Symmetry: C4
Subunit: 389 residues, 4 copies
């Protein structure tokens, strides 16, 4: 056991293979499955786990009614063995709250959750399963964070947090942790105009966080973090291939340093990309308006070229099925000379798009890169809504 | 592993951060969750766990009917991973009976349960998960104990027990254990006139037990124990801020050495406080009459000053929601230079306050000290009783 | 770490303290609890576990219907953490069949199950979780064994087995195992005329098995086994206090060497006793006709004196409640200078005594000796049969 | 821990003893049990586990409806502790997909699953719980594999795969893995004309794979693999005792080098055999037409003599009960001088044979060889289909 160092480059990726799928809604139709949303996966030296914000009720329970609501005193971050569906019997409570992140540094796991009222939230930072630090809201408006895993290097794990408006300038900070203790706090710098729900990974000693601009941009903000110097820079993804949801049609040219407006009717969704020159892949919903479908697009130089377009594609979820948030993770402890990109897609079921039921929940699908040319099919949730009526 | 020694001082506390909530009643409305009461938490070198007295049925089961009853041959102390809800599938039986205490001495856990008929109860003392000692009733009237964790120092774990009337003078003893064997027994001494359900913690080589006087006082008795000499003193919390339930209004002056009587209609409830000069916090139900709401009041010198009032407060459970028992615990194995205060609140649902159902049970919330000034909100149970009708 | 040696003497016993109780039937009214019968307990260096023969269905399942039947291809020996109820989620399948025994030699656990048709059953002997040895029926009539734990000394664990009529002379053997391999087989010798379902325990290098004579005696046969020499003798309990069920009134004198007959209407039930001169205790159903109630009786010199009677008694289950099989076990790995006797009572619910349901199952209660004079109460099953109607 | 090698000989087998049975359909009538099919068992240094392809839904759930269907994005290979029934709470996801194999090389477990659309399937190869290698379909027609365990020798684990028509010549390959990495690929060679679903086992440094010819033969193809040279040969079982399902009556002579045609109405079923000169056993369904009943036949020189007939038999499942797939496995880590043959029988319930329900699933029974002459009885599933109507 030692601290993880981000000493390896990203593996070449040409295709995406299936890693895990929990079929939670299908199973939760009759088994005791907790309602969730905002899932992800995170790994450690022993393997990978799935994570999500429980709503403190089962899917078939009468308390599933009303779970469209994002914040309550009944939510908590829970983790479970990858592949299983989350039940009250197989899940570990990482922390209490309604927004979270988590990562392993090679020694222990840090987990963070925000809870409390809108104008007075606080974060609690846990390490090795114990509470270490507490951070009060600094802008009095829903202190909140990534909703996917953080990334560590030589013991130092940066985390992106925001507090302030969802539709206006907000106060974002990069907080650098070691064993759950604050090493440094920076205010967000650079040209990104709004930051939410960053999806982050590391490679070659560099951490990149592709985030959600909920205020103006249909293009995604990118923050580049040096976890050794504990400094960062920010801007937008340059590609004309817009990846936020509710975006206009892709334009002739993207914009590296300003948001591209437009889209209807959603201001944003969590998402991700892996940016590695020619070896760059962008995820997005297939629908430009809604959280339906999901596609991976290989867009060489998407980080630096406003003219970059797709040279290959892979449908992860067809546009006849619902998707949701998407984010990045990597099994940094794999026995490979490169760090292989993985991602998950949250498959939201229920409200508001399916209003024949009273609840909102999701299942999870996750895939990682392949150098091979693999065939594919749609990994939709798979549940029949009529069965819940 | 080594014996825990109470060598550290209490951490400074200015507010309370969320530690855990199990949402047991919400989840138990449709998953297989045990009916409980008298819950608490207790930690060890590896972490913290939740404890409670099962009723030997699930919340939705037909045998949940009648569970307002406190004592039966179908109760047992159970423990389980912090944050999970107590099911028949994830709970460890610590011992059999209907009143208990438990604590880890740094090497192993000691667990104690009382069972039997009112006029002939006995305690069984467990250590390392094996029964070590048995203790028969000495006053033939519901031999009973703490209903929250005991505390250990150099292997010596004092426990406060009582046998005798609930509504008149009784026979309290402090029994000193090491590896589940009786080292010494003392009869209660000092100015506390009635002792029940003590909530105890350790700091700076001194163990403090804040208890319930079910006979006269609305102020809580306080026993101070020297675990090395195995001797003690007792009196009452000096503060005018009364913390028992069914208490009258706070008077102008409290009384260190005599009970402050009054209040209606109930003689008492298990509660707690941390007492450390200016760094003192008293918990109580917000209602002076019923087990509803729960608030933490910072009252400097509450332990010694009859005129001490609150300088701050934090609502833990709003007064439109049910509370219950409350008690102290500490993660004595945390990687801190001080012992940080934690507490839990039992959130009782069902009878007698909610008679639309035939059962009585509870969920749990737990919080710990923070040196920061954190925002707060209500951590009420969150179940809808109508769903159970 | 090492093979257990039976070198310690039995602890002095003056009353019985509660060890465990699973409340399976109460819990199983709603939770997913397996139908069982023929339970017992058995310990190893880490702790104690509960055992029983599942019927391959849950209590509330439609397949619980018809579970009065003793033998099917759907039964198996399962073990689980002491105190929990047996569910499909927390039980380990030891082996497959419809008669069993099990014991730990200090290194690993041996478990044995018989299965197959009446005229052609077979035993499979398991060790450390792997199948070691198979034993075919020698008399073509329901090869069967103890239905409670065996006992090992220096790695040698003798097991008593019977093959032959239940209501006439049969063929009993003592098979000595080591690591699941047969070391020696002996034909039953001595004065016991019929042997079934032996309840065995060890002390001072000697193993005593108290059994059920289903053919003639209402007094119980006693087999004494020397595990080093691998030899034995047999006779009956001498006491006039008869302990099998469906017995006549206790006569003026018992008989050391021949069966005391009589009783109505059933030939036998599994039972046990601890025999240590003055320190001797006999368990039996309170009713002399049916398996109801259960009492422990201290009968000095029960093993040698035909006029020995009780000098103390403890009611374990009141005569208004159903009991069932009873058997011996000891936690040989306790941190004590003596081996402390323990026993369990099988609490049978359903058919044939409770015919308003279609199933037969049980719950378990277990107790151990105390040197103290402890109060007591009835530890009956606690389920309300009407809730299953 | 070392790499396992196959130098030991097969144990002599004269009868079959019961190893395990999970009773999953009986139990799943009321507990939360996953719908499965294509089960098997596989062992490692610690013991054995049960495997199967889940359908991503419980047996009682509404999504059970439609589970006759073999391939969907909702299936996954799951493993669990031998003897338990597969629930959402005790199952490990080995990989995602609708065809699999798995085996332990003495150091870690390799698991492989195929998923994707019929024309573009892909395999993901896992080792030690991590994804290692991906393989795209090469014939573009349902790439598929063994549905029972693979076998490893000195780090090398051969796997047989097929891609192509089910009803005509297809493209079978042997792929040799080491730590999940491809060491070599071979096209099928020899006189076997069609290969599906091989049941494989090792002894004397040689792996034999007994398969299913779904195109022509009612006799079973046999593939002999040398795991050191990484080469193979193929032909058919010589015996007149035909072991596929939907076969004609046994002819007077079998055929070592060509398929024997006939039987109605089904083209084949996964099965197995142990081939060891005189010590040879063939399994098959009792019915020549349908997947009903199951018998083991000892047929000396079945691998080499076309006139070889049975010299003994054992009924495993009577012909009044449904059977299904059957396959081979061995506990190669047993403490024995020889490798003892084991096998399982999949017990299919529901569609198409039991059309009164909407689902298809199964339970499992497994047996291993014995040198003794043990009696036997039928180990059928035991659920009442009426209870599911
Ligand atoms: C802390 C919190 O409530 N986060 C919520 C965020 C915010 O609403 C937006 O990022 C605006 O800040 O996104 C969601 O609401 C959403 O769009 O589904 C889900 C998530 O629970
Ligand atoms: C899951 C689904 O049905 N998605 C469909 C959506 C939704 O019906 C609307 O977004 C509802 O507002 O509409 C589309 O035009 C889109 O947005 O891509 C087509 C897509 O197939
Ligand atoms: C052993 C026992 O019965 N303890 C019970 C005590 C006593 O009744 C009082 O302390 C009076 O002695 O408090 C309760 O009843 C109560 O107030 O809810 C709960 C608890 O179960
Ligand atoms: C949980 C709850 O509703 N509490 C309410 C109680 C209860 O109605 C009574 O205690 C029932 O006896 O009444 C109050 O006046 C009080 O006690 O402060 C107001 C409080 O909001
Ligand atoms: C193997 C077997 O069937 N054992 C059964 C035995 C025998 O019937 C008797 O000992 C007569 O041999 O006792 C029972 O039937 C019984 O009385 O409740 C239960 C047990 O299952
Ligand atoms: C559990 C129970 O009800 N036991 C009762 C039994 C049974 O009813 C009969 O044995 C059934 O045949 O009858 C008694 O006379 C007896 O045996 O002592 C009284 C006892 O209270
Ligand atoms: C990958 C796949 O679908 N395998 C299926 C195979 C193929 O149909 C045949 O081997 C023909 O190739 O056999 C089954 O269908 C069957 O007979 O019950 C079950 C199994 O799921
Ligand atoms: C389980 C069962 O009932 N099997 C019966 C089968 C099936 O009914 C048919 O195969 C359905 O196609 O028919 C038989 O003639 C046979 O196959 O030997 C008799 C056998 O008892
Ligand atoms: C089916 C159901 O339970 N519906 C409830 C409804 O009764 C209630 O009015 C609403 C507001 O809380 O929440 C939902
Ligand atoms: C709904 C229900 O079960 N009610 C029962 C009732 O029949 C019984 O009179 C009471 C006392 O035992 O317990 C409760
Ligand atoms: C309620 C129920 O299922 N009853 C069945 C009954 O129909 C059947 O006659 C009997 C014989 O097996 O088993 C039981
Ligand atoms: C009882 C039930 O749910 N039946 C459904 C049926 O309505 C549907 O037509 C069929 C095809 O999808 O699947 C099944
Ligand atoms: C096979 O394993 C055995 C037992 O570990 C070992 O003695 C032998 O050297 C190995 N044989 C080969 C050929 O590797
Ligand atoms: O409630 C304790 C204290 O809280 C703060 C202020 O509201 C004070 O006026 C008050 O005394
Ligand atoms: O039960 C044993 C003894 O218990 C006591 C008294 O009730 C005696 O009469 C009795 O002999
Ligand atoms: O069943 C195969 C063999 O079984 C035995 C004898 O009945 C033989 O005659 C028979 O060939
Ligand atoms: O050229 C059409 C195609 O270009 C690329 C992307 O911008 C797509 O959104 C678009 O459909
Ligand atoms: O792969 C087919 C596809 O390749 C790219 C472009 O050349 C398209 O015109 C063409 O349809
Ligand atoms: O490179 C794939 C595809 O790209 C585009 C066109 O240039 C095609 O001619 C070519 O086949
Ligand atoms: O990226 C997915 C995309 O690929 C191209 C076309 O086949 C589209 O229909 C599809 O949406
Ligand atoms: O004398 C009555 C009493 O004596 C003694 C025992 O034999 C009991 O069974 C009996 O009830
Ligand atoms: O037998 C003597 C005595 O033993 C004890 C109890 O069973 C009493 O009922 C009985 O009188
Ligand atoms: O041992 C039980 C025994 O105790 C004595 C008396 O109360 C009897 O009625 C009872 O049977
Ligand atoms: O007696 C004919 C007999 O021959 C042998 C086997 O092939 C059996 O299946 C068959 O019944
Ligand atoms: O085929 C010879 C013989 O083999 C064995 C059994 O299958 C018998 O039914 C059969 O007669
Ligand atoms: O191999 C089983 C076989 O044995 C012989 C006969 O009893 C047949 O009826 C039976 O099918
Ligand atoms: Ca946006
Ligand atoms: Ca009081
Ligand atoms: Ca008898
Ligand atoms: Ca065929």
């Amino acid at each position: 056991r030692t601290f993880l160092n981000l000493t390896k480059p990203l593996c070449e990726v040409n295709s995406w293979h299936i890693l895990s799928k929990d079929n939670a809604i299908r199973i939760g139709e009759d088994a005791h499955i907790l309602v969730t949303r905002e899932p992800y996966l995170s790994c450690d030296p022993q393997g990978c786990r799935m994570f999500a914000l429980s709503q403190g009720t089962t899917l078939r329970g009468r308390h599933a009614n009303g779970t469209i609501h994002d914040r309550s005193p009944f939510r908590a971050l829970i983790s479970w063995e990858m592949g299983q569906a989350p039940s009250p019997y197989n899940t570990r409570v990482e922390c209490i709250g309604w927004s979270s992140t988590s990562c392993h540094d090679g020694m222990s796991r840090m987990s963070i959750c925000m809870s409390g009222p809108n104008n007075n939230a606080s974060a609690v930072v846990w390490y090795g399963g114990r509470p270490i630090t507490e951070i009060p809201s600094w802008a009095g408006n829903i202190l909140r964070t990534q909703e996917s895993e953080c990334v560590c290097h030589k013991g130092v794990c940066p985390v992106v947090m925001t507090d302030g408006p969802a539709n206006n300038r907000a106060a974002t900070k990069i907080i650098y942790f070691k064993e759950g203790k604050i090493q440094k706090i920076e205010e967000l710098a650079g040209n990104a105009q709004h930051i939410e729900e960053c999806s982050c990974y590391g490679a070659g000693g560099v951490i990149k966080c592709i985030c959600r601009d909920n205020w103006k941009g249909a293009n995604r903000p990118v923050i580049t973090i040096d976890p050794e110097m504990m400094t960062h820079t920010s801007k937008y993804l340059c590609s004309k291939v817009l990846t936020d949801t509710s975006r206009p049609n892709d334009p002739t040219n993207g914009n590296c340093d300003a948001p591209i407006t437009g889209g209807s009717p959603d201001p944003g969704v969590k998402g991700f990309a892996f940016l590695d020159g020619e070896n760059s892949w962008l995820g997005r919903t297939i629908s430009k308006d809604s959280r339906s479908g999901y596609e991976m697009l290989k867009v060489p130089n998407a980080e630096t070229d406003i003219q970059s377009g797709p040279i290959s594609n892979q449908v992860i979820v067809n546009n006849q099925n619902w998707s949701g948030y998407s984010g990045a993770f990597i099994d940094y402890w794999a026995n490979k000379e490169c760090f292989n990109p993985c991602f998950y897609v949250e498959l939201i079921r229920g409200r508001p798009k399916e209003s024949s039921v009273l609840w909102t929940s999701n299942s999870i699908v996750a895939l990682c890169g392949s150098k091979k040319r693999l065939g594919s099919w749609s990994w939709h949730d798979g549940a029949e809504i009529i069965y819940f009526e």
